Amino acid sequence: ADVPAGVQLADKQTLVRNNGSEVQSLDPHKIEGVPESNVSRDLFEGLLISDVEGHPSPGVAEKWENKDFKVWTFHLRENAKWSDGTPVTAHDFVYSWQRLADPNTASPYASYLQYGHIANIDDIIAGKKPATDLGVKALDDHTFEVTLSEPVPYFYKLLVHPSVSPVPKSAVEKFGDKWTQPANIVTNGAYKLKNWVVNERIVLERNPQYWDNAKTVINQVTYLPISSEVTDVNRYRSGEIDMTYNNMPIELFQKLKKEIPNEVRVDPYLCTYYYEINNQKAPFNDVRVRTALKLALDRDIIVNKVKNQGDLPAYSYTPPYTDGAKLVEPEWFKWSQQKRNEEAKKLLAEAGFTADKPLTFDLLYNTSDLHKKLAIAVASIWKKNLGVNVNLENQEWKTFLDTRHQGTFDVARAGWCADYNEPTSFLNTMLSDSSNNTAHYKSPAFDKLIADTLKVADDTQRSELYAKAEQQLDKDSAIVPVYYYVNARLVKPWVGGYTGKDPLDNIYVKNLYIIKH
Ligand SMILES: [U]
Ligand SMILES: [U]
Ligand SMILES: [U]
Ligand SMILES: [U]
Ligand SMILES: [U]
Ligand SMILES: [U]
Ligand SMILES: [U]
Ligand SMILES: [U]
């Protein structure tokens, strides 16, 4: 943290943050969500980190160079250490990125290395080459060199993600899946794990071996797993929670904006809320049905009337304000809702649905006040505008993610937040073989449009190709875009160092501080 001149700090430097739900894991190679990455950034630090405003900045690597955007060399600071005191080395990153790539690890983010195009990744994922062939090598203890199969000008932007953070080989090998217990874990970020009580709390304590430890101010942070946004707001207002999670409840938000204006932080956020359709399950493998659902949902009612927290009605998957996005707004979005509704009823009648045999399916969502109120409003809107019946089902976060990967579903509530600020951070997730593709969408046309993007060395040509990729997705109605999020949460007046300028919301508790109050 960089504490402004003249601010007076509290004696006690502890922080309580709500984290949305129980993390899937603390293993950087087994995680894929916001809750999971919130905690991962305090414990594991990769090559680069985001600074307080979100810019890619020195992490373990103090400086780096590239040759033709294909060979990237990272110079690792000499005093980077793990919490047990041993040095963080380039060999740590070699082993880690090989473990990420290895199909035996089954990482949900194994495709992150395809997105950066590291050499040999495709064969590695397919089991044709061992993970030791991955295009990474430690030139020495403080030098990590990455070789890509094609130029990737924005490659270094990928490197703040938890999936490319280092893991400690010796703890992993000795303890297997219990390497992350508090008695066994070893960490290299600003914090260390103190306690982990499932469905109760995660407590982190300063890591004195962290290379930037002298600038760390908060000595302890607890992460809570409260999925009820109403409860999170209540425990914030009672004094227990210093920072809510960034999902706000429909029950209380309008009241909050008028009662505590200064605590309600509302900032840009590169995340899209949508209903993910399982594209390989009938009748959702029929474009007419996916299109009807997309068109009959009334975004103005949901975004401006039922939620009304600043979100913007969505017509695409990649948010239009992503760096590099120049999207074409489709004609259906400018129509009236009436005109969308006829076309949608038309398409279902054409798909063979009638009043006597209507379209009935499940709408799965992760337990949450917000998602349940949005799902009920969407069910009612779909019933009224299209005559479809929906059976709502909630599941806890971890289970919800497994279901989506299994494909044991019809439609699911969904949100994707960028990992790096470039359109391929969204678009790559719809690639046929993407480990992140829970829409189970497979389009040879979509895949080729994206493959073409690194075969041109022109930003305009690249942006036009992303725009066409979004058009292919929309044409196929892969998903139901609902709104582009705003980052809305409550933050106590004494929590300093949260700017709201990072559109990725990559917060590091080592950058925060408690003001005397
Ligand atoms: U005190
Ligand atoms: U650039
Ligand atoms: U940029
Ligand atoms: U179903
Ligand atoms: U509620
Ligand atoms: U460029
Ligand atoms: U106080
Ligand atoms: U106090």
Side-chain angles (χ1 to χ4, degrees):
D2 294 321
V3 176
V7 326
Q8 246 203 96
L9 298 169
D11 270 359
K12 195 169 172 302
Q13 293 290 330
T14 58
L15 184 76
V16 177
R17 289 187 67 186
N18 188 51
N19 200 40
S21 42
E22 182 64 23
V23 295
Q24 291 168 287
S25 168
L26 295 187
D27 188 331
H29 295 154
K30 306 288 188 167
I31 66 172
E32 69 200 304
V34 174
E36 293 66 23
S37 302
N38 280 346
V39 186
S40 198
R41 289 186 301 276
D42 292 331
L43 300 175
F44 301 98
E45 177 182 76
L47 295 171
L48 278 63
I49 56 175
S50 297
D51 69 2
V52 289
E53 288 176 25
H55 321 291
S57 301
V60 176
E62 52 188 321
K63 64 255 287 107
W64 52 95
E65 301 79 54
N66 83 80
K67 170 30 66 182
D68 308 326
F69 311 110
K70 287 177 41 172
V71 179
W72 289 79
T73 303
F74 298 89
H75 300 286
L76 312 189
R77 72 195 56 260
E78 270 157 45
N79 64 336
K81 304 177 200 202
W82 289 99
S83 52
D84 58 6
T86 71
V88 179
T89 64
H91 309 291
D92 292 308
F93 284 86
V94 166
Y95 164 80
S96 298
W97 293 21
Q98 294 166 353
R99 186 168 178 255
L100 173 55
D102 186 338
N104 290 337
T105 316
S107 174
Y109 260 96
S111 294
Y112 206 65
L113 301 167
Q114 293 173 306
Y115 308 161
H117 296 97
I118 291 71
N120 295 322
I121 183 63
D122 288 354
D123 274 350
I124 289 156
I125 291 171
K128 306 176 175 172
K129 308 187 174 108
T132 44
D133 276 28
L134 185 74
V136 298
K137 60 189 47 179
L139 297 186
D140 71 33
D141 282 359
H142 307 300
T143 308
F144 184 59
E145 185 193 72
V146 180
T147 298
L148 313 189
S149 50
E150 55 189 348
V152 182
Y154 54 90
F155 180 66
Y156 73 89
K157 298 174 33 159
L158 265 69
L159 314 179
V160 304
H161 197 259
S163 78
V164 288
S165 288
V167 304
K169 182 179 178 173
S170 84
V172 173
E173 272 167 7
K174 176 149 167 190
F175 314 102
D177 49 23
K178 292 161 296 306
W179 80 264
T180 61
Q181 283 305 117
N184 310 324
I185 200 179
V186 166
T187 54
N188 77 314
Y191 292 90
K192 302 194 266 192
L193 177 66
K194 199 193 172 163
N195 307 280
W196 181 7
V197 186
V198 175
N199 276 151
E200 260 195 24
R201 65 187 62 250
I202 284 170
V203 180
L204 310 187
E205 62 192 340
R206 176 197 292 271
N207 168 19
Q209 307 292 324
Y210 181 55
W211 71 267
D212 214 13
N213 188 56
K215 303 205 184 175
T216 294
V217 176
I218 298 274
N219 289 315
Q220 176 182 284
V221 51
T222 293
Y223 281 88
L224 306 169
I226 303 166
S227 62
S228 157
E229 299 87 8
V230 175
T231 304
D232 182 4
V233 169
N234 291 334
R235 301 187 180 172
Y236 170 95
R237 291 190 88 179
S238 82
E240 189 190 340
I241 299 177
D242 299 300
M243 302 176 61
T244 62
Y245 181 65
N246 54 354
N247 270 352
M248 289 284 84
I250 292 174
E251 289 96 324
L252 305 186
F253 192 77
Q254 306 315 308
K255 297 152 191 308
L256 301 174
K257 195 24 144 169
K258 300 285 95 98
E259 301 186 52
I260 52 175
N262 298 324
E263 294 180 46
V264 181
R265 307 298 204 90
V266 176
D267 297 288
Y269 197 17
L270 287 169
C271 307
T272 298
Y273 191 111
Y274 56 109
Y275 288 93
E276 174 186 80
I277 298 172
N278 175 359
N279 282 60
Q280 45 182 231
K281 186 188 165 165
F284 303 101
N285 51 351
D286 190 335
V287 70
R288 311 175 287 203
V289 169
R290 310 196 292 270
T291 302
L293 291 174
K294 180 182 76 184
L295 295 179
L297 191 156
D298 185 339
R299 301 159 176 78
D300 184 81
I301 293 173
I302 284 156
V303 203
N304 306 143
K305 298 154 163 49
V306 348
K307 204 170 165 264
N308 195 249
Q309 307 184 340
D311 314 281
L312 270 40
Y315 52 80
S316 68
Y317 184 44
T318 300
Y321 43 104
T322 299
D323 191 342
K326 310 167 159 273
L327 304 195
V328 171
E329 180 180 303
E331 285 308 308
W332 67 258
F333 193 70
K334 306 192 263 222
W335 303 341
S336 59
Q337 186 56 43
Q338 205 217 107
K339 175 179 186 187
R340 284 185 291 275
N341 288 345
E342 276 314 295
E343 178 66 36
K345 303 175 295 216
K346 179 182 81 195
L347 304 160
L348 292 188
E350 280 167 29
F353 291 95
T354 64
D356 189 75
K357 23 200 83 105
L359 163 63
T360 295
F361 59 81
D362 310 313
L363 177 39
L364 175 67
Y365 67 94
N366 53 298
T367 309
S368 161
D369 287 301
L370 173 61
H371 305 317
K372 170 163 53 166
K373 288 184 146 32
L374 303 173
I376 292 170
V378 167
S380 174
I381 290 168
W382 274 337
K383 175 64 181 193
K384 157 162 233 59
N385 293 355
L386 186 56
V388 318
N389 306 301
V390 161
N391 299 124
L392 265 57
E393 311 168 345
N394 65 288
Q395 278 173 4
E396 289 314 302
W397 187 239
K398 190 174 197 177
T399 298
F400 178 57
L401 304 195
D402 172 69
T403 299
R404 288 169 63 192
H405 283 296
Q406 293 170 173
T408 32
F409 82 100
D410 293 332
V411 180
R413 172 265 135 198
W416 179 261
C417 288
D419 299 326
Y420 55 99
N421 198 349
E422 208 277 341
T424 60
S425 191
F426 270 71
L427 289 167
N428 283 343
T429 70
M430 295 287 185
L431 298 172
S432 292
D433 63 342
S434 177
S435 70
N436 296 136
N437 192 335
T438 49
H440 294 269
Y441 174 78
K442 294 211 171 49
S443 165
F446 180 85
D447 294 348
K448 159 61 139 51
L449 285 167
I450 300 316
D452 286 352
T453 77
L454 287 171
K455 277 137 204 82
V456 306
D458 178 323
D459 269 357
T460 286
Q461 282 188 88
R462 206 174 272 137
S463 285
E464 296 187 328
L465 285 168
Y466 295 152
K468 304 173 186 16
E470 284 278 349
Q471 286 172 331
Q472 174 72 50
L473 218 47
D474 183 49
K475 180 185 302 124
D476 297 331
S477 283
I479 63 160
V480 182
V482 177
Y483 60 79
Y484 304 115
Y485 288 62
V486 286
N487 182 356
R489 49 157 53 90
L490 306 182
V491 176
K492 287 295 173 53
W494 51 83
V495 179
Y498 178 77
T499 68
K501 303 263 255 144
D502 178 7
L504 302 189
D505 197 47
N506 281 318
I507 296 322
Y508 294 82
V509 175
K510 77 191 175 60
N511 293 328
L512 305 182
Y513 52 95
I514 307 309
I515 299 168
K516 200 161 218 194
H517 60 283

